[PDB]
Design a protein around this ligand. Structure first.
Ligand SMILES: Cc1ncc(COP(=O)(O)O)c(CNc2csc(C(=O)O)c2)c1O
Ligand SMILES: Cc1ncc(COP(=O)(O)O)c(CNc2csc(C(=O)O)c2)c1O
Lengths: 383, 383
């Protein structure tokens, strides 16, 4: 049966890693957040069973998630228009959304930005959905090519899904402004798209509430949407697989009926979700003391990334780059395109032991005050 | 988009629950195992990051899993013929297997026993695979209808998958004898079936090694097979979602190549698996002291279930059932068909507040010395 299967399509370990996918602090570590350790201690002391969660996971996790996404006192919440399933990570949330859509709706196509996270195409294609790309990146001004975006999306038909990164666009760090979000929300209504928000970085651009502005602009305009959120980066809970799939419909009857089929899609996949990480998130979010400690830890990460963006631009200037890199200061989250070509990136790896992805994306959190000068000297050397 | 979706296809809470799905101790609780609490304390003290696991999860978890399944010193292990991905539960392992098979092989059909766990059909159908049933249960002798099983499976074509419960058949508690396993292994080779072992209860029939005899009889005969295993019941880790998908092929080159596609199927689903539960399992299995405590806890559960099987039969006789229920003593694991009809089960619920599933399956671990007499009086009343 397996003898003819084709293979599916480390060098760092065998120097600086900007190709990493996680947050690193100023010492180059990805420690467990203190709020998380405190919550894990509480769970160790107080859990009396590991009995299965319901298919949609811990109720308090769902409530806290909806408040994060929509705001406390949101009409969507008041009107019981949203249902949330706790999932194994943002990836699990995307796949539950894709399976739900493939099996229960006429959706055949999802629109994703060019560029995006490479796994988007894999997830949607796995559920039998085609993926189409829309223009996004103005590589000259290192900005959002808004006109190109809108012209691309004119090819999207009514009933197609359009995926939006909520904030901290991966890989570019370029997000729509609030006005641009509002223009897109209007356009999406007019064109009949189903918005799919992928929100893996809430809190890493400007703040928890600010980073949800775009989603909230869409939620104010649409009867229906889906949000796939992740707590991997903003709680440092990567390996515990903590995300959420939130379904929004016109009213409570409709969302409950549709959500029954979302739960059926989960039941046929992994049955019910992993408790430990989501219980940590619910414990923290629902406790004033822990939430305050967590919110400050997240602010500390957001700010450290900002300081590295500024230090990177300043240090490149000091090392004689003689090029405008100011765009980096304005970009949001851990990732930016450096503007280096695939061959400069290869050179960077081979001649200097500095590792980025081939697109020239760098993880600004791999940068530290200690590694910044050698890193920038290397970049200057390949310009 | 959602306005026309059909709904997917508590009374207990609103008396005795034999329709429960988990182990209960003699006090009616499903506590966290002591070995698990000790491992969780160790992890709280020693974990320094939540950085993502690889797609296939914690290496030590994979090694310990293969030793459990195949035996230490197994030729499959020595010859590097097996690769294991840690998954979110046995259900996750079944779905990864189904997605792997649907996308990378010519499999179109999976054969499942009539009866089985109801979610088998949901999982395989979700991956686009048809499910066919084979005969299993001799409702007169309350035994394995082996002739019917073999005659049913004669309809299976070469290249179909046949699913076997490794031990503690759910819902019947009726397992093949070793000789019957050996006959099935031979037949499977001759007919070209791909065996899929579902092993959710290792340790609950006679013991860890004994309960793997049937799988090992198949592994001795086949170049290829897949095992979907779960640690939910044998570690009491239900909600942490701890299982494994083990792929076996003729040699190391072939299994590595095929497993690359299994990892691609995982990447497009939930990316990488939840650490906490599998880390508990790896910590326990790899430590002589913790493993000894765990093995005794599992023995305690296995034995308590045996004592309830014996107490149930004795108590039914004492309460005037006047029917042979001796078959219960011989059956394996938490589940047995009581032999009650769907209407007797309904009556049991409505008139007596005793809850079983409509098939008459009962969870023997919902039985305790304290609840046994009323439960049996109720059953006698509906006979
Ligand atoms: C836009 C977007 N969508 C989905 C995901 C998946 O998040 P988790 O499944 O890890 O929670 C992520 C984060 N997953 C991820 C891990 S490394 C990485 C990268 O781009 O390096 C990305 C994301 O940035
Ligand atoms: C034969 C078989 N296959 C797969 C599974 C799934 O196990 P987990 O996904 O819970 O690890 C299980 C256990 N899942 C389960 C939870 S309640 C239940 C039942 O039959 O009541 C079954 C099983 O018995």
């Amino acid at each position: 049966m397996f003898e003819n299967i084709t293979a599916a399509p480390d060098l760092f370990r065998a120097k600086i890693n900007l190709g990493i996918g996680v947050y690193k602090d100023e010492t180059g570590k990805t420690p467990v957040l203190t709020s998380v350790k405190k919550a894990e201690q509480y769970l160790l002391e107080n859990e009396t069973t590991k009995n299965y969660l319901g298919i949609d996971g811990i109720p308090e996790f769902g409530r806290c998630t909806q408040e994060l996404l929509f705001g406390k006192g949101s009409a969507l919440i008041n009107d019981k228009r949203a249902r949330t399933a706790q999932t194994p990570g943002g990836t699990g949330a995307l796949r539950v959304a894709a399976d739900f859509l493939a099996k229960n709706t006429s959706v055949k196509r999802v629109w994703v930005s060019n560029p995006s996270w490479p796994n988007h195409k894999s997830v949607f294609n796995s559920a039998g959905l085609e993926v189409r790309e829309y223009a996004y990146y103005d590589a000259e001004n290192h900005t959002l090519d808004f006109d190109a975006l809108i012209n691309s999306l004119n090819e999207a038909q009514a009933g197609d899904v359009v995926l939006f990164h909520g904030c901290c666009h991966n890989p570019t760090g370029i997000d729509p402004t609030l006005e641009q979000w509002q223009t897109l929300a209007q356009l999406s209504v007019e064109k009949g798209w189903l918005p799919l928000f992928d929100f893996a970085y809430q809190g890493f651009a400007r703040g928890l509430e600010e980073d949800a502005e775009g989603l909230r602009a869409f939620a104010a305009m649409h009867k229906e949407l889906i949000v796939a959120s992740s707590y991997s980066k903003n709680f440092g809970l990567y390996n515990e697989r903590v995300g959420a799939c939130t379904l929004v419909a016109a009213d409570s009857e409709t969302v409950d009926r549709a959500f029954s089929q979302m739960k059926a899609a989960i039941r046929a996949n992994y049955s019910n979700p992993p408790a430990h990480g989501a219980s940590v998130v619910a414990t923290i979010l629902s406790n004033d003391a822990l939430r305050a400690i967590w919110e400050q830890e997240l602010t500390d990460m957001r700010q450290r990334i900002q300081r590295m963006r500024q230090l990177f631009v300043n240090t490149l200037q000091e090392k004689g780059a003689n090029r405008d890199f100011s765009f980096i200061i304005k970009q949001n989250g851990m990732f930016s395109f450096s503007g280096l070509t695939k061959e400069q990136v290869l050179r960077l790896r081979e001649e200097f032991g500095v590792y980025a992805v081939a697109s020239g994306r760098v993880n600004v959190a791999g940068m530290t005050p200690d590694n910044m000068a050698p890193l920038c000297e290397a970049i200057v050397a390949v310009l």
